[PDB]
C-alpha cells in the first residue's frame, strides 16, 4: 500500500490521473518524481518550469552545477538529483522531443530508465511541449515500464482522452 488516490488504474503497474504533478508532488512527497528534462537540464518550461518553480529554483541551481561538471545527458538518458521540496528524489528523463526532430524511437529508450525505481510519480514523457503524441507516449509507457508508476496528466480534456482510447 502507498500514499497515491484517486488514481484509475490502467494495468497490474501503471495508473494515471488528471492532475497537477507539481500540487500531486507536494503533497504525496514521493520518493521519485520524475521531470520532463532536456540534455541540458534548462527547466525553462512546460513540466520542468513548473517543477523548477515550485523549487524556488533550487532544482535549477543544483542542475547547473550537474552540467557544469558531467555535460549533458543523452536524448533517452537520465539522471538522479535532489527532489527539493517536491519528492525524495527527481528523476530528470530527457524524451526526445519532436520540436527539435529527434527520433521517437528513443521515448521507449527514454521509459526504461522508470524501470530503475520500484515506484515514479511521472508526466507522460514527450507529451506537452516537447511534440510528440500522449497517447503513443501512454502505450510505449505501458509496453515499456514494469515498475509502479503513477501519471499525472495536467489536462482534464487529454486525460479523459487517453482513458476513453486506452486499449
Ligand atoms: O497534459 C499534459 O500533461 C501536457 C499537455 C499535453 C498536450 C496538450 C494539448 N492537448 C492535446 O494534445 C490533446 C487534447 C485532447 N485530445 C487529444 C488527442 C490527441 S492529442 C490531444 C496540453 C498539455
Redesign the pocket.
Known amino acids: 500500500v502507498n500514499s497515491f488516490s484517486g488514481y484509475l488504474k490502467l494495468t497490474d503497474n501503471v495508473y494515471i490521473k488528471n492532475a497537477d ?1 507539481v500540487e500531486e508532488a507536494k503533497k504525496v512527497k514521493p520518493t521519485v518524481v520524475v521531470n520532463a528534462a532536456n540534455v541540458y537540464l534548462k527547466h525553462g518550461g ?2 520542468a518550469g513548473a517543477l523548477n518553480k515550485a523549487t524556488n529554483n533550487a532544482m535549477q541551481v543544483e542542475s547547473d552545477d550537474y552540467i557544469a561538471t558531467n555535460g549533458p545527458l543523452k536524448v533517452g538518458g537520465s539522471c538522479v538529483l535532489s527532489g527539493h521540496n517536491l519528492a525524495k528524489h527527481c528523476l530528470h528523463v530527457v524524451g526526445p522531443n519532436v520540436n527539435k526532430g529527434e527520433d521517437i524511437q528513443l521515448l521507449k529508450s527514454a521509459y526504461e530508465n522508470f524501470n530503475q525505481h520500484e515506484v515514479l510519480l511521472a ?2 514523457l514527450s ?3 516537447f511534440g510528440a ?3 503513443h507516449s501512454l502505450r510505449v509507457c505501458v509496453d515499456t515500464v514494469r515498475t509502479n508508476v503513477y501519471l ?4 482534464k ?3 479523459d ?1 487517453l482513458v476513453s ?1 486506452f486499449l
Open positions: 504533478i512546460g513540466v508526466p507522460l507529451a506537452g511541449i503524441d500522449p497517447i499525472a496528466v495536467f489536462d480534456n487529454l486525460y482522452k482510447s
